[PDB]
Amino acid sequence: MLKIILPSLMLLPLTWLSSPKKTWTNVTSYSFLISLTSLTLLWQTDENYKNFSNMFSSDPLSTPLIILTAWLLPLMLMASQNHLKKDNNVLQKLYISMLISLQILLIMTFSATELIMFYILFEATLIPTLIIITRWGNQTERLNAGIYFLFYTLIGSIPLLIALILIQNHVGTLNLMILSFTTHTLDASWSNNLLWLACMMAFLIKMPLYGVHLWLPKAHVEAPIAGSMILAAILLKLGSYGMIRISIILDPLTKYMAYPFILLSLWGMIMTSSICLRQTDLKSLIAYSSVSHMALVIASIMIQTPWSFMGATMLMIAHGLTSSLLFCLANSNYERIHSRTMIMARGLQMVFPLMATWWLMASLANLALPPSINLMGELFITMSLFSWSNFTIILMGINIIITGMYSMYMIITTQRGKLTNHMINLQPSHTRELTLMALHMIPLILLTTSPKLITGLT
Amino acid sequence: MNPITLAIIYFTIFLGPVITMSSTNLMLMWVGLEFSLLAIIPMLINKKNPRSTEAATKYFVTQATASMIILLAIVLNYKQLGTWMFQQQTNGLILNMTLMALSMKLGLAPFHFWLPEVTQGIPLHMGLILLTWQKIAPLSILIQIYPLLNSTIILMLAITSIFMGAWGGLNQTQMRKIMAYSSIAHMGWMLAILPYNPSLTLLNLMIYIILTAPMFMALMLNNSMTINSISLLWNKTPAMLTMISLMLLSLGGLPPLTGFLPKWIIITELMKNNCLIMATLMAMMALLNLFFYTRLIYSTSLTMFPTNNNSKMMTHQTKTKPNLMFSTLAIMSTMTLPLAPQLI
Amino acid sequence: MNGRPGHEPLKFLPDEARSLPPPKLNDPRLVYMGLLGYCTGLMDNMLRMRPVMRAGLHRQLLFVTSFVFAGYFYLKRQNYLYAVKDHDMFGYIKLHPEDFPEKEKKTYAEILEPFHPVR
Amino acid sequence: DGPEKNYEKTLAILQIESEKAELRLKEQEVRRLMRARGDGPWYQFPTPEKEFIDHSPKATP
Amino acid sequence: PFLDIQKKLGISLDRHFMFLSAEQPYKNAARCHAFEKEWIECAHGIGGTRAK
């Protein structure tokens, strides 16, 4: 997998060497094709996963993501052509390159055989992200948000560093292939009960768990649209990908060491879903929607039943695409409105007829409408959770009712009701804004036709 | 300085560490330490400002008593073994006093108080020589006595320095003070692996030298001893803003940059030796060091602090070209993690 | 390590390292050092405020060619050091055979790892 | 090119990684032994030169 | 030692006088010249870990 990567690196030379006026089209047009080369990995006509070479591999779980990581770089670069079009021609070429490095790094992290290669690349992605959030962040508080995003991930990260070096001494190689075909069975000691927490905690932090998710609402609030898309679509899912490949070892402990997180997540799912119900900042509501719909995932990567994992892989790819779509349209309202407040800007369909159709489909993806991969995902996690304990439906049942309420409230108070009297007149929709959306949903429609591809390893 | 004097002093400041390293007769190692003490004091008071005399008089007393303690260890050994050099048989207290005295010279941890105060009030150029060139001579003695020194003493010396260095950094805003508090922490990592992997002790030094030497020549390019002063870097010289950003995050352990390797292999070696108690606590507060590094990042790069009108005047006159080596060690630092296997 | 028999007290790479294969000049690493170098050059131009890529085309070369030169002769050594490590390591495994006996794991048929059910 | 290539490539990747793993662990055991044993070329700490002994009459027994 | 510029250069400015059995002026052997010799010709080729 060096075509999904080397051609990517070369994007950086192109963003720099290219003309200031033509820099945007060379980069966006080329990474669209970079995504097309990424599609070749999907050709798996056999169970044997594809070990491209010693360090680089792609199995069913990584492949559905590498393609998404390559896909969003085009979109990210199309959603940030407006803001970041007021810059000095060298601030742009830095932002474009920053976005380019994220997927170079993220493509490799999702396509990495050695778990510590994951760690080095895993924690590197913070550098590009923190720059995108802090340097271009509009609000006074991004310095703070950046600190929260760096420390919560970093304090979790050093325990994983110690744990992975620890297993290398215990087993003798951090190669995901071998670690899988070798006997690593923890022994339920008090210490192992700590190892397990060391490995999972760093992944559980960037996958916002109810206890440590305050970093994500603060980060996406002041982050620029491209950073918020990356955090929701690819960055948070880095934590899920890690939990799937790391729990191959630590096989016995999670049977009983998971209860704490599972309950934290399912109760967390309800409270995070509910506070979405009365949050005035739209970007705030989408972020907590992201916490709740990701709290379902940590509760399926821990129950560990084939369907859970399959539900998780379905939901992660699906929610990734949906969330961005929501964060992308939130930005389009923010740029004309100039405020994140949900109460202002009422009645837009009256003035932006189509964006409202995109808003409606994004919300229906947000809630579980049935001919969507989003529902298949939740339906499956719901099933397994029920298997774990029939009572789980109650808590995963209060979340479904709440999820319907906030998803439609975003449509009802942003895209319906009487028009706002006279905010700065809202200029019509650009074709870029609409495509950036179409590019998010057309793939959501196509993937829903053949869910097998994003079905996970299980 | 009459250029002749400059030569004699500089030769001594350079013959000082070199005799230490080359000789085996400890005595000759002691005088190497003594010559470094004598040579550094003249340069320290070059401005001869009231702050400077204070600096040198402290540096000298701290250095002198430690030098006398190191000599006492050699004198005692001479009577416990006729040899003029530490051996397997050496009484444990003999080595422990040597360990304490050289840590005094390095200002490793309990004696860490002298290093920030001495660094403040001496020119930045001499400060670089004080923090890097002066430090090599004491550690060379320790690398030689690697098997003999006791594990428990330096482990606690190392953990103490990580804690004190990190705490000192958050409160200090004086840039030169900040450079000293990182060197106390980095010195702690070096000694932590000293009884285990000396090669790694050395690596954790070179990388510190290849990181700090560019960082200081950056601080002086604009001669800013304040963060507020380095924050207006964007107006005085915009290009160094990019690398100053990466070098400081490299000084802390963040993974893509060269700075991770020293911490990573030291942790790998300590876990190989089973200190998974000690290594864990060190790595954790090591994370505190990055917080103050990033706070500076914020002021200098990620956010643009307001500047005075006279700054436009300094932009006008042609800027002093930074040194040829600033560029090479800036890329050597921050970009050599792919070359890590051959480095160790 | 040191103290190892025959150690060359101050030499860079003892001739014994002749026996090892020479590093291919295009070894990814030496090529990296090259890029590492080009960047140093470009960076310099930048810090000194010169046209970044169109200046010092002589220096550019000194850099890309100094770093690379250094590489071949360094890697040539680091390669030796690692090679000594095996000579040393493998030898000991034999000279002191009893301490590193060859274990003989049982075909899974025989071994009985317990099965924790997920249910 | 086929199922054959990845299957055979993955087995080659596993053999390199399995052999690297066994050696890395044996290093740690050899390095434990030579440090304490001191019977191997690594961890051979120095003692003074026999070379500078004065083997002469010295006007004394 | 750390940098053996002495063995390399062949010079011996610091090794001729490190032990009591080294050449004493006018060949006046010191006390113990007998033992230290017996101690250090023993521990020669045998590293410290096994000179102990």
Binding site: - | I344 | E16, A83, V84 | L23 | -
Partner: peptide
Amino acid sequence: ARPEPNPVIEGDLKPAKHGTRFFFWTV
């Protein structure tokens, strides 16, 4: 009698087995 000298590992160098075995460096 002096203590027997410790054994001498013998042979000729061969490129390191699998090269540097640092984490994930196929090198």
